[PDB]
Amino acid sequence: MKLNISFPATGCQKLIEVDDERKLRTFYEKRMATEVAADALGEEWKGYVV
Amino acid sequence: GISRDNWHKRRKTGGKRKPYHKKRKYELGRPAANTKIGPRRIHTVRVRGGNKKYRALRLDVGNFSWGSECCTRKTRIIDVVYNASNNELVRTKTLVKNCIVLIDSTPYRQWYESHYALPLGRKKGAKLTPEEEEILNKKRSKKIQKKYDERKKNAKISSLLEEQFQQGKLLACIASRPGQCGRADGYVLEGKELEFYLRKIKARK
Amino acid sequence: ARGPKKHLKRVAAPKHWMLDKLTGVFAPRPSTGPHKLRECLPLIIFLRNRLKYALTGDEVKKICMQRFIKIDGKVRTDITYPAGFMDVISIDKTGENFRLIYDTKGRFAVHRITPEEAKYKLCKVRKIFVGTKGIPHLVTHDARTIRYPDPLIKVNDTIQIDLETGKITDFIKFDTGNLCMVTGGANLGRIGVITNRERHPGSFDVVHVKDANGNSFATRLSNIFVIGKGNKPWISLPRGKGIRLTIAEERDKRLAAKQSSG
Amino acid sequence: ADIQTERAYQKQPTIFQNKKRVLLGETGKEKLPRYYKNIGLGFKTPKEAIEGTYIDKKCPFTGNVSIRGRILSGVVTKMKMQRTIVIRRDYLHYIRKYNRFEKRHKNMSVHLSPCFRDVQIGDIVTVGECRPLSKTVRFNVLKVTKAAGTK
RNA sequence: AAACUGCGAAUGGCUCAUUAAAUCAGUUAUGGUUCCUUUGGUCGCUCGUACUUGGAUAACUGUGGUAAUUCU
RNA sequence: UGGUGACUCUAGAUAACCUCGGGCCGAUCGCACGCCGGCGGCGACGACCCAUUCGAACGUCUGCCCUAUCAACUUUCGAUGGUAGUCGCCGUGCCUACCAUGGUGACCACGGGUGACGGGGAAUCAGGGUUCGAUUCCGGAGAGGGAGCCUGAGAAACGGCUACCACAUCCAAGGAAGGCAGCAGGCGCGCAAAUU
RNA sequence: CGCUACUACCGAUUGGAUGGUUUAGUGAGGCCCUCGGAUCGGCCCCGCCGGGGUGCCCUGGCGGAGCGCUGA
Numbered sequence A: 001m002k003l004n005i006s007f008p009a010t011g012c013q014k015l016i017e018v019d020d021e022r023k024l025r026t027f028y029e030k031r032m033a034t035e036v037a038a039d040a041l042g043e044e045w046k047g048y049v050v
Numbered sequence B: 001g002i003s004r005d006n007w008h009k010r011r012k013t014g015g016k017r018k019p020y021h022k023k024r025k026y027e028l029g030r031p032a033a034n035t036k037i038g039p040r041r042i043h044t045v046r047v048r049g050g051n052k053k054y055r056a057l058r059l060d061v062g063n064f065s066w067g068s069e070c071c072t073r074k075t076r077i078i079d080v081v082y083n084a085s086n087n088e089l090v091r092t093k094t095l096v097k098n099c100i101v102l103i104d105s106t107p108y109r110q111w112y113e114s115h116y117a118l119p120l121g122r123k124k125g126a127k128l129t130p131e132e133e134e135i136l137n138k139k140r141s142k143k144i145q146k147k148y149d150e151r152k153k154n155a156k157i158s159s160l161l162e163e164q165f166q167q168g169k170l171l172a173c174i175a176s177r178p179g180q181c182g183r184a185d186g187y188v189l190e191g192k193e194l195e196f197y198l199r200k201i202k203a204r205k
Numbered sequence C: 001a002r003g004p005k006k007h008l009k010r011v012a013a014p015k016h017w018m019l020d021k022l023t024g025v026f027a028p029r030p031s032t033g034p035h036k037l038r039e040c041l042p043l044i045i046f047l048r049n050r051l052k053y054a055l056t057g058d059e060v061k062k063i064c065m066q067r068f069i070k071i072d073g074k075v076r077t078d079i080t081y082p083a084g085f086m087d088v089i090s091i092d093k094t095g096e097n098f099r100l101i102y103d104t105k106g107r108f109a110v111h112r113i114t115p116e117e118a119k120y121k122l123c124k125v126r127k128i129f130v131g132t133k134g135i136p137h138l139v140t141h142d143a144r145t146i147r148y149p150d151p152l153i154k155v156n157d158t159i160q161i162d163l164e165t166g167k168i169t170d171f172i173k174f175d176t177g178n179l180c181m182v183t184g185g186a187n188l189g190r191i192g193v194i195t196n197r198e199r200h201p202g203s204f205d206v207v208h209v210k211d212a213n214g215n216s217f218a219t220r221l222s223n224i225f226v227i228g229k230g231n232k233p234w235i236s237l238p239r240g241k242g243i244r245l246t247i248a249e250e251r252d253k254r255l256a257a258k259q260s261s262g
Numbered sequence D: 001a002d003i004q005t006e007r008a009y010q011k012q013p014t015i016f017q018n019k020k021r022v023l024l025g026e027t028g029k030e031k032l033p034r035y036y037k038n039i040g041l042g043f044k045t046p047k048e049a050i051e052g053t054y055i056d057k058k059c060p061f062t063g064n065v066s067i068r069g070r071i072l073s074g075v076v077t078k079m080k081m082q083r084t085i086v087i088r089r090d091y092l093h094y095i096r097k098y099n100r101f102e103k104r105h106k107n108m109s110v111h112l113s114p115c116f117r118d119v120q121i122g123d124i125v126t127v128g129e130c131r132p133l134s135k136t137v138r139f140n141v142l143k144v145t146k147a148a149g150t151k
Numbered sequence E: 001a002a003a004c005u006g007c008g009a010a011u012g013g014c015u016c017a018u019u020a021a022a023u024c025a026g027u028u029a030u031g032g033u034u035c036c037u038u039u040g041g042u043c044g045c046u047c048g049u050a051c052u053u054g055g056a057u058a059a060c061u062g063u064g065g066u067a068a069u070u071c072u
Numbered sequence F: 001u002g003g004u005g006a007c008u009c010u011a012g013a014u015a016a017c018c019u020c021g022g023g024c025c026g027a028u029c030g031c032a033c034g035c036c037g038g039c040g041g042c043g044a045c046g047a048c049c050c051a052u053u054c055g056a057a058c059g060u061c062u063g064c065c066c067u068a069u070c071a072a073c074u075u076u077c078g079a080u081g082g083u084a085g086u087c088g089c090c091g092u093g094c095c096u097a098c099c100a101u102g103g104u105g106a107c108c109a110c111g112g113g114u115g116a117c118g119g120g121g122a123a124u125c126a127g128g129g130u131u132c133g134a135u136u137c138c139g140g141a142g143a144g145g146g147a148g149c150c151u152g153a154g155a156a157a158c159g160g161c162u163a164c165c166a167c168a169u170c171c172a173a174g175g176a177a178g179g180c181a182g183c184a185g186g187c188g189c190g191c192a193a194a195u196u
Numbered sequence G: 001c002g003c004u005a006c007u008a009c010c011g012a013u014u015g016g017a018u019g020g021u022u023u024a025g026u027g028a029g030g031c032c033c034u035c036g037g038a039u040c041g042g043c044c045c046c047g048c049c050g051g052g053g054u055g056c057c058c059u060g061g062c063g064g065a066g067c068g069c070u071g072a
């Protein structure tokens, strides 16, 4: 399940390929326009909200 | 959808008419605006030619005219008491043209007491709290008092309207079409029309 | 047919345009304007078929887009503009002025007028109504509405309009003894003095008109246009002075012209 | 003749009947003013319409209708509806193959005002075209002429 | 160029299945209605930031999804 | 004030109203440039309303082929008329409520059939007639069959959309896309009709 | 009466096939009404505040929260 992540401050976007369901379980059952703490995506994602 | 064509009808001889074309847009009809009494709700309809029809769904205020006194005021619509076409319209409190309605009498009483300097629709307790004692008696120059005394000679209301003013509610007829103009206007019933509708209302119950 | 029609079949065009049959399927289809479709002369027909200034429609467009044609003193760049009765067409580049006047055979003749006479026109009045704080209003056959007209001006009268300003200068009342032209029907193009008008309430009124040669003819009231006061016209008449020759005298005149030719 | 027989109140809309009246001018009733119009085309207003009290919104003289277009004549054949009658128009239709006519007729339902009383089966009526008044009625009786042998 | 906006796309072309006072034709009516456009009138008639107001969105730039569309 | 054969017309006066799904009362563009410290000439767009043009839509009057082995029909679910309303751009059983019992017919109603779209017209014809008119002009209807709508001044539009019925295209089987009675062209049908 | 052929009828079969009307029930889809309220704002409130007057509020620009108030 690809993730299309955009950073409006710099205007840069990236397509990440996350194939681990444990990481993706954070977003499950969440509706659009809901802010979720993206921590399970990776260690470098610590403190990020998407 | 809803149609208003004359070709789906039988001929005057009773024979069936076979249609020669399908339903046209200019023969359309629309669902009725069963206008109720409540806080104002009006929807607009785009009609033929690009013009606009106002479709009143709820109304609680109207512009009603006292013809004998030529006093037109914006009053509050209270209840529906008679409908010459259907009784379910009275039962459901639907405002249509020629429906008999009870309207608040306060603006007319205010105009009467300010124009004739005579009490109207008052009980015998004679409270007459200030700013009404002033509007009823006041102090005026000789010319102004003379003009008011001249007015008082031809200020006599029919007994039926006086009774209604005592109750605080007048009987009125709606002369507008709320489902087409979005307005419930009309005139205060008086004279033989008032007697006719009073008799009809009493006989209905 | 949903919505308005935008084409005109050539064989369905009005006959007084004198359009042939083999040039095409369609006809110019006059634009909406001050004159009715059946009673007008489109600019292209006049500029190409009548005056032969242009050979094709594209040449007519090229002429009109240089702003050379003026209809009643205003530049008209629409090639299908409906120019009708009593209209004045001015071409300053070549310096001529025409007035659209019906010929005896019910066709718009090429009638050249002097530049002095091109400063005004005559309009039949169609209705008078009061509006907008009691201001009277006149409506003419040319679809121009004039406020504050003379109180004497009644329906079926004729008013002289100064084209530059658009105001009334004088008028002729509709009455017996006044000269008139027939602008529709069988007697279209005929000029004569009004003899009598018979009224049929709820129906059309019939007007009897006598020529200068003694011939009489009737028309409907809506087909009468007052041209002059008494016997004298207020405009210049075409070469045929409004009198209709029978086919016999027309043939005799043609034969006499042939004999005198050469 | 009581004129209030419907659920609604019958009244000429143009006339205002609630004008204030002082007691000094209370000689019985005010004799409610009557609205009536003169339809053109040289037709006289019946005295009944002027001095009557009936309410008829389709009346050519006291109602809201305009006489326009065709004026025809017929013979009254039936008077079994309220305020409207059925008249018969007879004519001859030509057939060119035989150079001969055939008798034809058509009925017409025309509105009859209460101003025309004592209308019998057999008299002549001059009717005039108006706007559609019902599904089948497009004419209003303007004049009634008695039959050739009336009393 | 593109894209937004405006206009047109209700004309034209085709065919004759339906349709028997219906269509249609001549004659009348709308004083019983709607009307883009063209043309003329009207547009300080109203006694109550302006030396110019606000938020977007497309084109464009970049990340894409689907086997597939004038999809998004 | 003005008008019409005829307004309950037009204009006037008065008391109010004036819809948050709002009515007008210019926050727009171009070209020339100017004069006396501010005023301005041509245009182009836009706009409520009135008139005009192009219409359209309902009506009035008269006119249509065969058939009685179709003689009574319509009316309980509007048939005919009245009163009040709803809806509609408006007049109207157009629809509703309550009333009345009406309305058409041997002068052919009602029903059935048509190898029936209607006219302008065509063939033949001494005179009278008979037959044809799908077909280039006018009017109508339809876009495989019904139905329902959006937008728009104007469609119940199909070279617009939404369904169902009948056909039918691609598919990775999850889905997507259809409408030549337009011009060519193919199949089929046929005695019968042209170039992608 | 006998020989051959054709047409047509009655047709037992409780004929079918196609089509067209309806009774009763079900009923897609649009449209209207009454609700519904995923989201997106604006005002307000603060941490945040640029400067005017002067710490002094009248307006920029943020973040947080308020089933605060309202709009779509």
Ligand SMILES: [Mg+2]
Pocket (backbone or CB within 6 Å): B049, B050, B051
């Ligand atoms: Mg409009």
Ligand SMILES: [Mg+2]
Pocket (backbone or CB within 6 Å): C001
């Ligand atoms: Mg067409």
Ligand SMILES: [Mg+2]
Pocket (backbone or CB within 6 Å): C202, C203
């Ligand atoms: Mg007339």
Ligand SMILES: [Mg+2]
Pocket (backbone or CB within 6 Å): none
């Ligand atoms: Mg575009």
Ligand SMILES: [Mg+2]
Pocket (backbone or CB within 6 Å): E007
């Ligand atoms: Mg345009």
Ligand SMILES: [Mg+2]
Pocket (backbone or CB within 6 Å): E008
């Ligand atoms: Mg369009």
Ligand SMILES: [Mg+2]
Pocket (backbone or CB within 6 Å): none
């Ligand atoms: Mg204009």
Ligand SMILES: [Mg+2]
Pocket (backbone or CB within 6 Å): none
């Ligand atoms: Mg009614």
Ligand SMILES: [Mg+2]
Pocket (backbone or CB within 6 Å): none
């Ligand atoms: Mg009725």
Ligand SMILES: [Mg+2]
Pocket (backbone or CB within 6 Å): none
């Ligand atoms: Mg009913």
Ligand SMILES: [Mg+2]
Pocket (backbone or CB within 6 Å): none
């Ligand atoms: Mg057929």
Ligand SMILES: [Mg+2]
Pocket (backbone or CB within 6 Å): none
């Ligand atoms: Mg035929």
Ligand SMILES: [Mg+2]
Pocket (backbone or CB within 6 Å): F134, F135
């Ligand atoms: Mg044909």
Ligand SMILES: [Mg+2]
Pocket (backbone or CB within 6 Å): F134
């Ligand atoms: Mg055929």
Ligand SMILES: [Mg+2]
Pocket (backbone or CB within 6 Å): none
């Ligand atoms: Mg055609």
Ligand SMILES: [Mg+2]
Pocket (backbone or CB within 6 Å): none
């Ligand atoms: Mg169609």
